[PDB]
Amino acid sequence: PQITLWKRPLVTIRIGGQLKEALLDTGADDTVLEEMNLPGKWKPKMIGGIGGFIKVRQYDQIPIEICGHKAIGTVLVGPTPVNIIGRNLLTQIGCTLNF
Amino acid sequence: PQITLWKRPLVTIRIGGQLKEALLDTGADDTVLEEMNLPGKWKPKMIGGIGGFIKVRQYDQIPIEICGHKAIGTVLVGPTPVNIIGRNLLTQIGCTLNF
Numbered sequence: 001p002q003i004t005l006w007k008r009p010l011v012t013i014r015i016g017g018q019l020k021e022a023l024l025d026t027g028a029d030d031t032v033l034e035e036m037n038l039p040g041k042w043k044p045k046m047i048g049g050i051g052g053f054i055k056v057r058q059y060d061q062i063p064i065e066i067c068g069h070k071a072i073g074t075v076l077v078g079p080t081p082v083n084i085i086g087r088n089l090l091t092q093i094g095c096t097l098n099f
Numbered sequence: 100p101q102i103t104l105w106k107r108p109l110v111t112i113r114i115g116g117q118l119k120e121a122l123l124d125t126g127a128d129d130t131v132l133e134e135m136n137l138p139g140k141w142k143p144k145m146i147g148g149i150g151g152f153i154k155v156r157q158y159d160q161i162p163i164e165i166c167g168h169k170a171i172g173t174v175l176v177g178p179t180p181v182n183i184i185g186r187n188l189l190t191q192i193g194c195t196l197n198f
């Protein structure tokens with residue numbers, strides 16, 4: 001599909017038994033999801049944006065479905081106000097910017 | 100052009116006769132540039148991000164040429180970690196997400 005940017009590019013994602021709305025975000029290197037208790041090993045990380053840094057937990061090889069498109073990769077979990085699908089997963093679902 | 104997302108979508112912009120690199124950022128409502136001088140009246144504003152809130156200066160009706168495409172709109176200037184082109188200008192240049 002084609003998503004215009006008149007409004008925030010929110011789409012439905014699935015991670016386990018959780019459906020959530022998330023931004024397709026070309027400005028995000030990494031995928032950052034709001035606080036959730038995922039299974040498995042993780043490592044602590046800091047990520048920076050407007051206003052400074054937040055502490056996140058990095059989980060590897062997590063499957064996520066994004067508008068029915070399958071993805072699997074690193075997801076950062078932490079105190080973000082919005083679920084952010086970053087470039088690591090945007091590429092896996094074939095997402096490009098066009099103008 | 101079509102822009103893939105295996106690398107950051109950084110582009111050259113022209114503003115006030117100056118060339119800068121900026122990130123095409125579909126997760127950003129607003130265009131926010133690092134500290135710079137722009138002419139004319141501005142208004143103090145505060146905006147939020149992943150790390151908290153910052154103070155910015157809001158300049159209206161500023162021409163920016165983004166990758167050869169002309170925009171005229173609101174530019175916020177302040178302590179963003181990198182120059183970002185947000186949806187307010189991405190829409191002007193006809194940018195969409197496609198997968």
Ligand SMILES: CC(C)CN(C[C@@H](O)[C@H](Cc1ccccc1)NC(=O)[C@@H]1CN(c2cccc(C(F)(F)F)c2)C(=O)O1)S(=O)(=O)c1ccc2c(c1)OCO2
Nearest residue numbers: 027028029030047048049050081082126127128147148149
């Ligand atoms: C500023 C960019 C260079 C980076 N950000 C991505 C931007 O697209 C963010 C996404 C975002 C959107 C909403 C809340 C928080 C983050 N966008 C922005 O910073 C601004 C913030 N923002 C906003 C608007 C209204 C309210 C608010 C809030 F109240 F939540 F702060 C934020 C908005 O529209 O764009 S980022 O989210 O900070 C980010 C994401 C992934 C990363 C990373 C940094 O480092 C490694 O991996």
